[PDB]
Design a protein around this ligand. Structure first.
Ligand SMILES: [Cl-]
Ligand SMILES: [K+]
Length: 295
């Protein structure tokens, strides 16, 4: 091998996140959204102005989908909730491991059919405690079981392949899908075996050409893979506990990257105060805006 691109981007938000995750962009308002999972915060950044707002949640949100200009869907440890964007009022939409207090939600992403894929996990990453679910029109269907840390959920440009990983295993899987529903039409196949290679495969996006861009926890990097699964580049970022990328900007042509301070000792934070910050890379990407969730 991958070509290394040292960081030449910028800091989008100087506030450090304990566990920055789940970033997404609303092109209609020009606003990036992400979570601070463990602190129950939903962060809002208006890009053009740099105006930052932090919204307190009664649960650990980990994924956000737009429904309309007035409504969003939030996946959390306590279920799936509708959020009114004007008032911030939250209303239960569907249960999601709502009777499993030992688990929380993690990585999730919208399929172009309007269905959400969302991962869950034991709060201590208990082996095999997690799953990946499909949510469409409030109906929840389990897709994959026995996953310790679900991650890297994303989809090919035509909606016909899904990708995911168990971060504890680091074998990125591909799944053939029905593009009209986002449901699998075949079993998962190993696409990228990165087992034993340093760092954990965390959140991913898939660009307009079908390349996967994966945040690598512990390596301060976003790794890019071509459509054969070759590792062609590594884009360095200052926060080493890299968690997730997102396409941002008016042409979905910039890349936002969240990071985390979780577990890091005080000396580590002192040595690198950029742990946990939210960045933009210096390079162009050819992205796509996230699909809307269909009620
Ligand atoms: Cl160009
Ligand atoms: K739960």
């Amino acid at each position: 091998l991958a070509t290394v691109f040292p960081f030449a981007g910028r800091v989008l938000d100087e506030t450090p996140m304990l566990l920055g995750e789940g970033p997404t962009f609303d092109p209609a308002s020009g606003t990036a959204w992400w979570f601070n999972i463990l602190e129950r915060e939903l962060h809002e950044l208006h890009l053009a102005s740099g105006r930052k707002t932090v919204h307190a949640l009664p649960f650990m949100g980990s994924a956000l989908a737009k429904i309309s200009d007035s409504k969003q869907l939030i996946a959390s440890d306590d279920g799936l909730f509708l959020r009114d964007t004007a008032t911030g009022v939250l209303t239960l939409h569907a249960e999601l491991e709502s009777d499993l207090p030992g688990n929380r939600s993690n990585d999730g992403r919208m399929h172009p059919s309007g269905a959400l894929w969302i991962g869950t996990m034991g709060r201590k990453a208990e082996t095999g405690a997690g799953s990946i679910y499909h949510v469409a029109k409030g109906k929840v269907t389990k897709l994959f079981a026995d996953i310790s840390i679900p991650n890297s959920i994303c989809f090919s440009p035509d909606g016909t392949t899904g990708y995911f990983v168990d971060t504890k295993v680091n074998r990125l899987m591909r799944v053939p899908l029905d593009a009209r529903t986002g449901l699998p039409t075949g079993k998962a196949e190993v696409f990228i075996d990165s087992t034993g290679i340093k760092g954990g495969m965390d959140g991913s996006v898939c660009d307009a050409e079908g390349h996967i861009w994966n945040a690598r926890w512990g390596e301060g990097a976003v790794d890019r893979y071509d459509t054969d699964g070759n590792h062609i580049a590594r884009y360095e970022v200052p926060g080493k506990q890299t968690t997730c990328p997102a396409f941002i900007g008016p042409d979905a042509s910039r890349l936002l990257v969240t990071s985390a301070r979780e577990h890091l000792d005080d000396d580590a934070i002192t040595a690198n105060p950029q742990h946990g910050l939210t960045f933009e890379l210096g390079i162009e990407v050819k992205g796509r805006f996230e699909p809307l969730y269909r009620l």
